[PDB]
Amino acid sequence: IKDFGGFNFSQILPDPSKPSKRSFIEDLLFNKVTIKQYGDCL
Amino acid sequence: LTGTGVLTESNKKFLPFQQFGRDIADTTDAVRDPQTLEILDITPCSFGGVSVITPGTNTSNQVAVLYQDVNCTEVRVYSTGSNVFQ
Numbered sequence: 364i365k366d367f368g369g370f371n372f373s374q375i376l377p378d379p380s381k382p383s384k385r386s387f388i389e390d391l392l393f394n395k396v397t398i399k400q401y402g403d404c405l
Numbered sequence: 406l407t408g409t410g411v412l413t414e415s416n417k418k419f420l421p422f423q424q425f426g427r428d429i430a431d432t433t434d435a436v437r438d439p440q441t442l443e444i445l446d447i448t449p450c451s452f453g454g455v456s457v458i459t460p461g462t463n464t465s466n467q468v469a470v471l472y473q474d475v476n477c478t479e480v481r482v483y484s485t486g487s488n489v490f491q
C-alpha cells in the first residue's frame with residue numbers, strides 16, 4: 364500500500380523491473396558516470 | 406630482442422621498413438618474424454594476484470587461496486580440485 368498522504372516515492376523507491384535493487388533516479392545516477400581474465404586482451 | 410611471453414598470430418599494418426611495435430609504456434607489443442614474415446603480437450605471460458585467506462594461525466593452519474580477477478580455468482593442492490568457487 365502506498366497511502367503516503369499523496370507523496371509519490373515511486374521514483375526513489377526500488378523498481379522491481381530494474382537491476383534488482385535500483386530506483387529510477389539511482390539508475391539515472393549510475394548512467395551519468397563512466398574481471399578482465401587473460402583471454403580478453405590476448 | 407629477448408623477452409618472455411605468448412606469441413599470437415595477429416594482423417597489423419607494418420610498412421616494409423619496420424620490425425617491431427611498441428606499447429604506450431615503450432615496451433614491445435608486436436614483432437615481425439625475421440623469416441616467416443608475419444606481424445605477431447607479444448602478450449605478457451598469464452599473471453595473477455594471489456591472496457591467502459586464513460583464520461588465526463593458532464586456531465588452524467588451513468588456508469584458502471584467491472586468484473584475483475582470473476577465470477577458474479587458467480589456474481599444487483590449491484591449484485584445482487572439487488572445492489573451487491568462481
Ligand SMILES: *[C@@H]1O[C@H](CO)[C@@H](O[C@@H]2O[C@H](CO)[C@@H](O)[C@H](O)[C@H]2NC(C)=O)[C@H](O)[C@H]1NC(C)=O
Binds near residue numbers: 373
Ligand atoms: C507516481 O508517479 C509515477 C511517475 O512519476 C506514476 O507512474 C505513471 O503513471 C501514469 C498513469 O497515470 C503512466 O501514464 C506513466 O507512464 C507512469 N510513469 C511511470 C514512470 O511509471 C504513478 O502513477 C504515480 N503514483 C500515483 C499513486 O499516482
Ligand SMILES: *[C@@H]1O[C@H](CO)[C@@H](O)[C@H](O)[C@H]1NC(C)=O
Binds near residue numbers: 439440441
Ligand atoms: C628463409 O627466409 C625467407 C624469408 O626471407 C623464407 O622465404 C625462406 O623460406 C626461408 N628458408 C628457409 C630454408 O628457412
Ligand SMILES: *[C@@H]1O[C@H](CO)[C@@H](O)[C@H](O)[C@H]1NC(C)=O
Binds near residue numbers: 461463464
Ligand atoms: C587465536 O587468537 C585470536 C586473536 O588473534 C583469538 O581471537 C582466537 O580466539 C585464538 N584462538 C584460539 C584457539 O586460541
Ligand SMILES: *[C@@H]1O[C@H](CO)[C@@H](O)[C@H](O)[C@H]1NC(C)=O
Binds near residue numbers: 398476477478491
Ligand atoms: C569463464 O570461462 C567460461 C568458458 O566456458 C565462461 O562460460 C564463463 O562465463 C567465464 N567466467 C567469467 C566470470 O567470465
